Design a protein around this ligand. Structure first.
Ligand SMILES: OB(O)c1ccccc1
Ligand SMILES: NC(=[NH2+])NCCCO
Ligand SMILES: [Ca+2]
Ligand code: NA
Length: 223
């Protein structure tokens, strides 16, 4: 997250870190047994780390649970990033408490201008690299479909939203991929792609979760 602030510890209890020797992507806990993330994050083995704040220190409230199933969207396209969504089934249910909690799926899609919270352990520098120990947060609005499509001509599908700031300086970045965009208590976005990060007129692009509630529910019921 570039241009953000350090979240209060455990204040984002649905945020997970996906780990395969190190942190590589975010995810969101949406049921006791299922995390949603981005398909471009796929690895064939993943450990899910729940209840994290400092990913470099054991603080005591963590739950580390291996993925038992890793299911990418069948229409994920690696060129256009359409359908950039993945579900992970945990080998055992997460134990839900104040520090490890689900986030609701969307009841509807979000109005343009809705304020959201984006979070992750991704790069914090717009020049060079700095990967933080502490979970970072960013407040950002859903942009117009107009502002989004003008920023990336021919590249925004009906399964994508832009969230962020056209001036630059405030965005998700590499390592935030797969993590949450939560607006009015609903998971509306998954960190997906962009042209670099935090650049002028290149806002973050996010998988539009309000199109996938049926796919999510169907996959959960069938696995
Ligand atoms: O965001 B986008 C946008 C659309 C209309 C007016 C201003 C901004
Ligand atoms: N501009 C962006 N937010 N790009 C995607 C960040 C995750 O790689
Ligand atoms: Ca920790
Ligand atoms: Na432009």
């Amino acid at each position: 997250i570039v241009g953000g602030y350090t979240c209060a510890a455990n204040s984002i209890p649905y945020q997970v870190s996906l780990n395969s020797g190190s942190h590589f992507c975010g995810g969101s806990l949406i049921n006791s047994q299922w995390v949603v993330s981005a398909a471009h994050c796929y690895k064939s083995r993943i450990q899910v780390r729940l209840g994290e704040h400092n990913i470099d220190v054991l603080e005591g409230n963590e739950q580390f649970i291996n993925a038992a199933k890793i299911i990418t969207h069948p229409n994920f396209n690696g060129n256009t990033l359409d359908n950039d969504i993945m579900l992970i089934k945990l080998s055992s249910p997460a134990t839900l408490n104040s520090r490890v909690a689900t986030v609701s799926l969307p009841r509807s899609c979000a109005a343009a201008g809705t304020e959201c919270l984006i979070s992750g352990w991704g790069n914090t520098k717009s020049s060079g690299s700095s990967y933080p120990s502490l979970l970072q947060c960013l407040k950002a609005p859903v942009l117009s479909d107009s502002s989004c499509k003008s920023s990336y001509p021919g590249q925004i599908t009906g399964n994508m939203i832009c969230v962020g700031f056209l001036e630059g300086g405030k965005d998700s970045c590499q390592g935030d991929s797969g993590g949450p965009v939560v607006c009015n208590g609903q998971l509306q976005g998954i960190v997906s792609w962009g042209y670099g990060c935090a650049q002028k007129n290149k806002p973050g692009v996010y998988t539009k979760v309000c199109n996938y509630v049926n796919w999510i529910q169907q996959t959960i019921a069938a696995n």
